[PDB]
Design a protein around this ligand. Structure first.
Ligand SMILES: Nc1nc2c(ncn2[C@@H]2O[C@H](COP(=O)(O)OP(=O)(O)OP(=O)(O)O)[C@@H](O)[C@H]2O)c(=O)[nH]1
Ligand SMILES: [Mg+2]
Length: 216
C-alpha cells in the first residue's frame, strides 16, 4: 500500500535434498506464494529463473517466491543477489523491500558420505546408462557444493537463514515434513507479518502428504 516487503526463499542444497517436496508443501499451504522450478525452465528460454522471480513479485498479490534451484556453489548464490539487485528497478518501484531468506538443506556437520547415502537412495527409489547419468549429475552438484558462510561474500547478503535437518526418516517422520514445520515456526517467529494464521498441524500433514505422493 505504501511499503511492501517481498521474500525470495533460496535453497542451498544438492539433488534430492527435498527442495521440491518442501516447496510444494509450502505452496499447498500458501497458494498465493509462487514456486519457480529451475528444472522446468528451458535452457533456451527467454526469461530465466531470476527474470521469472522479479515478474512474480510485481503485483501486490505476490509477495513470496520459492526459488527452486540447488545453489550448491557459492557463485550460484552470488548470481541471485547480483542479478536481482541489478534488475529489480526494471519492475519494482522504490517502495518494495526485498528480503533474501536462505533455506539451508545440508547441515554443517553432515558428512559427504551421509549426504550421498541419503540423497542417492531417495533419488534411485523414485536405462542403466540413464542411472549412470543421474549418479554423475548428482556427483557434480556435490563436487561443487560450498557450505553457506554468512561471514563472507556472497552469503553475507542473506537477511536470514533457516537451518533444516537432513537424516534418514525416524519414528515414521519424514525429514522434509520436519523441515516444513521448522520453516513455518521460524517464519512466524522472525517474520510474523508474513504468515497470518499458522496452519493447523493436520493441514500441514495433508499438504505434505500431497507433495510426498506427487508423481510428476
Ligand atoms: N524417505 C523420504 N523421502 C523423501 C523425503 N523428502 C523427499 N523425499 C523423496 O525424495 C525424492 C526427492 O525429493 P525432491 O523433493 O524431488 O528433492 P529435490 O531436492 O527437489 O531434487 P531435484 O529436483 O532432483 O533437484 C522424491 O521421491 C521425494 O518424494 C523425506 O523426508 N524422506
Ligand atoms: Mg526438485
Amino acid at each position: 500500500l505504501s511499503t511492501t516487503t517481498k521474500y525470495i526463499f533460496v535453497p542451498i542444497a544438492t539433488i534430492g535434498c527435498g527442495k521440491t517436496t518442501v516447496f510444494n508443501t509450502l505452496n499447498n499451504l500458501f497458494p498465493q506464494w509462487t514456486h519457480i522450478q529451475n528444472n522446468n525452465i528451458s535452457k533456451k528460454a527467454k526469461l530465466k529463473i531470476c527474470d521469472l522471480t522479479l515478474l512474480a513479485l510485481e503485483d501486490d498479490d505476490q509477495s513470496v517466491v520459492l526459488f527452486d534451484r540447488n545453489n550448491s556453489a557459492s557463485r550460484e548464490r552470488r548470481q541471485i543477489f547480483t542479478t536481482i539487485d541489478q534488475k529489480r528497478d526494471e519492475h519494482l518501484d522504490d517502495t518494495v523491500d526485498l528480503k533474501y531468506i536462505a533455506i539451508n538443506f545440508i547441515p554443517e556437520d553432515l558428512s559427504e558420505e551421509e549426504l550421498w547415502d541419503i540423497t542417492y537412495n531417495r533419488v534411485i527409489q523414485r536405462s542403466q546408462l540413464d542411472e549412470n547419468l543421474v549418479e554423475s549429475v548428482m556427483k557434480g552438484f556435490i563436487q561443487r557444493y560450498q557450505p553457506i558462510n554468512t561471514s563472507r561474500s556472497p552469503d553475507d547478503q542473506f537477511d536470514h537463514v533457516i537451518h533444516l535437518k537432513l537424516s534418514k526418516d525416524e519414528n515414521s517422520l519424514k525429514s522434509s515434513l520436519e523441515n516444513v514445520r521448522i520453516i513455518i515456526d521460524d517464519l512466524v517467529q522472525n517474520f510474523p507479518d508474513l504468515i497470518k494464521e499458522k496452519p493447523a498441524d493436520e493441514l500441514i500433514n495433508e499438504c505434505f502428504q500431497k507433495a510426498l505422493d506427487y508423481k510428476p
